[PDB]
Design a protein around this ligand. Structure first.
Ligand SMILES: O=C(O)C[C@H](NC(=O)CP(=O)(O)O)C(=O)O
Ligand SMILES: O=C(O)C[C@H](NC(=O)CP(=O)(O)O)C(=O)O
Ligand SMILES: O=C(O)C[C@H](NC(=O)CP(=O)(O)O)C(=O)O
Lengths: 311, 311, 315
């Protein structure tokens, strides 16, 4: 029974029914991962990774997921310097040739739109591991799985998206997924120079999702189930380091912020964090960003299985 | 029965009978690669890769070949920065060390002659994945396999070698292999500054192989079974990027060139290409460079099997 | 059916963690691993386990020997060959956050870092075993383990021997950890032979004096070498000199292992070097049977197989 997606590129590809089904597979993958026996579901399949930007979680969780299911991995951990991209090769030619050696490609690129172009080129599945400041659909998938796992529900919740929303490929993809549930309220909390872009706002409005911008993080956090913090995306600011430092340091998750949050609310962060979540938050049971990262293993196991061998 | 070569370093090591037999094995490997069952021919064997220059096809095709045969791989994707070559270690000490962890070494180096020095140090097989602007024997092997596969014949054909011939480790090795067949005519088409070096010319003349220099690519291409285009090798020009740019734009494979070529002729390119084959050409069935790269998987599977377990 | 018997260490971070009886037992395991590595059968001892490597400094032997060891035992590896450029350390992530995240994907972490003390911090953060593959100029405990194994294998003993530690002692994380392990045996005499600017640091000297280990500084390598069982040469640690290249160059060329040095050494003595070498062991020496540094490097495979097995599945 074939998986309905040929590639995982954009958050809009997912409907509510598909998300619930993927979450069920991820819970089964958690059982496999905990098990003593080595799974062979993906024995014989090869994944090629192509990372043109740095990564710890997304690269290693995809590789670990593949190996835990019995598959193998062909890595390119720095494609800008060590692949023939360094000789001038286009992404499209890279994808065309790498598909000759592999069964699925995981690619992170520095240009928005790169993953869509890769999927159009390739006749094997492509997974977008982040395309510039564009999208990050598997982050969004594991984020919603984490919320459902931590809060117990997705309908009716209030979610604060905090920090660099303009450049945040994570919060952009997450916004698309949250719009598939009902009675979700989203607060945008950011410096004005990195407010959420109009393509997301217009999509949410067209989808009848209530959203509000606010600069009062303590007030917003007091009434949210989820506070989703982000890193200010320095690599997207070019030479405008004045604007980078202007956007930094203005919205911090600290012990005082936790003190106004409900007992059953959570803090999330796709990671890495710099200064925007203080270290003393980590000890709070509501600090969910390391459980969130761990959950990416099971979500990516589920996606690799579904794309390669189906439901 | 053991393979007659202990290392794969230079095109001159091959003879016609050996080439034919390797191609026969590559065709069997294509059946293995297609099959549903994961092969175990090389279970228990370990390949070490040592890439001191960038690579996409050569590095990933060797790793994929090894894993498709059931073996494993110890990768060094950027030996200059991430291996103890960065501390000043010689190539010979690197090779002597790495053989303690592995059964076969695949090395791409920036100095011509490096692969022969590695083979002389090692007591396990070494494969030259490119040694500066010197040679690239497995590229030449897959190139001749591709010509036989596409054209149906090697004896009697006409082959144009186009582009940066002086620095082209690909065309240098290919010339050595073409010399092993009967009545091959080779055309050299290049800017004067990157014409084929005298060592190749003298070898061909001494071996009775007809070659001809021409600056009229349209005329040459109308007469050839194979037009083999190359990238101008920017990394060999040092800081003389003025002479590099001056050598570009003079010999382009475009739809106009395809328009004068015979119906049964092909375009080849070891890749990557920049501007020297236009995107239009890819849609012509005669554009063989992506099939060529795919064939490298099967040829490299054949070589690994032969070097490690024999016939 | 009583289950595993856990190794007494939870992490391999510092040479002082080892005791004499544990070292002897580890060496026995390494000899068993040599039989496994040589066998035509693929071992499955570590089937299903994953090692994450995190290399923030260059490596050939340490990185590849750990990966080869893991695979020869049937385990798998998640590599980060250049963590500074290709991991989210490049975005500014702390070591502690990196370790906490990477343990979610793996069962053991092998880390080489540029700061002394990094491995201690990683072990404190992680709830899976961490192995220190080198923490700045601090320590290199698995080099020291394979070094002592090599001495036992080549010389036949560790008690009573004389060992010359030669070269850059100040910055040598290898000789620093080796000194801690040599102190666990009886009547070992240690000679320090170095340029003054890279003499052995006081923390090691004070530890040896407190442990009753006789040590002596000398500038006469021919004299020292003639009365030692082991001459352990090192590379002058260029990267630790940073911009002070004039001091680096002046520390070179003073203490060379060459054919003349071998000529004054005993028949049964050996030359060791954790590698890489530059000029400080001449090529001539490689042909002498006493030149042990490539056997030493090979022995690292067996010692690291032993450590991975012990830390993941026990005795
Ligand atoms: O980098 C961020 O701040 C968020 C996000 N982070 C990740 O995906 C985690 P990693 O970079 O470790 O794979 C990204 O967009 O890459
Ligand atoms: O680089 C070229 O232009 C031709 C040739 N290309 C290859 O081998 C393919 P790759 O660099 O992707 O491994 C080379 O000499 O490396
Ligand atoms: O670098 C040296 O001179 C000694 C020592 N060398 C090693 O561990 C071997 P490698 O760097 O190849 O892993 C080190 O401290 O890293």
């Amino acid at each position: 029974h074939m998986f309905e997606l040929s590639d995982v590129i954009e958050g809009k590809q997912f409907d509510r029914e598909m998300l619930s089904a993927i979450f069920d597979v991820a819970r089964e993958m958690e059982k496999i991962e905990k098990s003593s026996s080595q799974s062979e579901i993906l024995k014989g399949y090869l994944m090629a990774t192509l990372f043109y930007e740095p990564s710890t979680r997304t690269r290693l969780s995809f590789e670990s997921a593949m190996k835990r299911l019995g598959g193998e991995v062909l890595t390119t951990e720095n494609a800008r310097e060590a692949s023939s991209a360094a000789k001038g090769e286009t992404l499209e030619d890279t994808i065309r040739t790498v598909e000759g050696y592999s069964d699925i490609i995981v690619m992170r690129h520095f240009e928005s739109g790169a993953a869509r172009k890769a999927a159009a080129t390739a006749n094997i599945p492509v997974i977008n591991a982040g395309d510039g400041p564009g999208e990050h659909p598997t982050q969004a998938l594991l984020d919603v799985y984490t919320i459902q796992s931590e809060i117990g529900k997705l309908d009716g919740i209030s979610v604060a998206l905090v920090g660099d929303l303009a450049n945040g490929r994570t919060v952009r993809s997450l916004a698309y997924l949250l719009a598939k549930f009902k009675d979700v309220k989203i607060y945008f909390v950011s410096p004005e120079i990195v407010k959420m872009k109009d393509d997301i706002k217009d999509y949410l409005t067209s989808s009848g999702v209530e959203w509000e911008e606010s600069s009062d993080l303590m007030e917003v956090a007091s009434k949210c189930d989820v506070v989703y913090q982000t890193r200010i995306q320095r690599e997207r600011f070019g030479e405008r380091l004045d604007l980078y430092e202007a956007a930094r340091g203005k919205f911090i998750v600290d012990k005082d912020l936790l003190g106004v949050m409900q007992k059953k609310a959570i803090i999330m962060h796709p990671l890495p964090r710099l200064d925007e979540i203080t270290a003393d938050v980590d000890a709070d049971p509501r600090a969910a960003y390391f459980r969130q990262a761990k959950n990416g293993l099971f979500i990516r196991m589920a996606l690799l299985k579904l794309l390669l061998v189906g439901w």
